Ligand SMILES: Cc1nn(-c2cccc(-c3n[nH]c(=O)[nH]3)c2)c2c1CCN(c1ccc(-c3ccccc3CN3CCCC3)cc1)C2=O
């Protein structure tokens with residue numbers, strides 16, 4: 001299933017490479033050590049509501 | 053927006069408002085970065101000279117957090133025509149960068165395939181704007197939002213009098229009398245994925261507003277990502 005099974009456990013972008021899940025993030029985010037989560041590089045990252 | 057709910061503090065930070073010489077909102081926009089606004093091409097005919105208001109939630113009251121930005125470059129899609137409403141997309145480069153704060157933050161641009169397989173396949177997206185609250189009405193002074201179901205491509209074309217091209221998509225309700233309206237044009241259609249809002253559409257047109265058996269027509273943002281990317285380099 002890979003990316004079809006819960007987005008490949010990716011926070012954002014899911015790709016399939018050499019029959020495996022490869023995650024990536026939009027600009028302003030860095031991919032975490034686990035290669036799954038996306039970490040904002042600074043204040044006001046894209047697509048986050050400013051509720052706090 | 054007909055029906056829906058008001059955008060509460062910090063809920064729709066990517067909303068931009070195109071304002072004319074008379075300082076009245078006429079179209080919406082999406083904040084992409086500190087220098088770029090995404091809007092509909094048809095919006096560029098609604099006013100001779102226009103500025104971009106950000107962080108505005110209520111037009112009657114100067115919030116302080118609101119900022120007006122002048123447009124340096126208007127990057128309009130050459131394939132746009134009022135005859136078909138196809139390619140209803142434009143990118144605006146601002147003279148000064150937007151200051152990100154509460155109610156001022158950009159929406160994410162997704163990657164093409166993932167947006168199509170993962171975002172477009174979600175049950176709903178959120179449309180927002182300062183457009184008409186009833187088909188026959190005045191522009192809203194309050195920023196509104198509305199969760200709209202993604203509509204099946206076949207149902208979409210059957211619902212319409214006009215040709216629904218591959219650069220367009222339907223969203224809305226067949227019976228529930230809530231939808232975007234005149235003035236919401238060029239505004240955001242965003243799809244939430246794990247608490248991150250990605251820009252999926254540009255309010256384009258509709259046969260009146262909130263009419264039964266009809267939907268909101270949006271410019272499919274995925275179809276113009278490279279064009280969008282290229283525009284942000286100029
Ligand atoms: C009052 C009003 N609001 N509004 C609007 C605005 C924004 C959102 C929504 C919306 N979102 N969701 C929902 O229900 N409505 C509604 C519209 C109107 C009037 C009609 N119009 C429209 C209708 C049809 C076409 C068109 C379509 C295809 C080809 C050529 C054309 C253009 N040609 C055919 C006709 C002449 C040239 C253009 C404009 C609108 O879009």
Ligand code: NA
Nearest residue numbers: 110111113115
């Ligand atoms: Na205001």
Ligand code: NA
Nearest residue numbers: 225262263266
């Ligand atoms: Na409808």
